[PDB]
Design a protein around this nucleic acid. Structure first.
Length: 53
RNA sequence: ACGAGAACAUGCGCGACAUUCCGAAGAACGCUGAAGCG
């Protein structure tokens, strides 16, 4: 059995899904900075509970 | 005034000794998190 090393050169963006979709409520979108902060829900909820927010 | 009268078919003695229910054996074969775009 022969073996080879596959080199996938990405000429177009590739999205292998994970079965999980989030909405703009779940994560952060700084439009002016144009950056999306992916956050985890439990930490945000506990932070808001600590801050009373 | 019975071929009769007594007279335990009895005594000591382990169904016991040696033994692997093991030997061989892939829970794996195929399987794009993807299709349409409203």
């Amino acid at each position: 059995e022969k073996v080879y090393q596959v080199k996938l050169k990405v000429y177009g963006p590739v999205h292998i899904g994970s079965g999980k979709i989030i909405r703009k409520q779940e994560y952060i979108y700084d439009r002016r900075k144009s950056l999306a902060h992916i956050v985890d829900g439990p930490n945000l909820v506990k932070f808001l509970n600590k801050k009373g927010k």
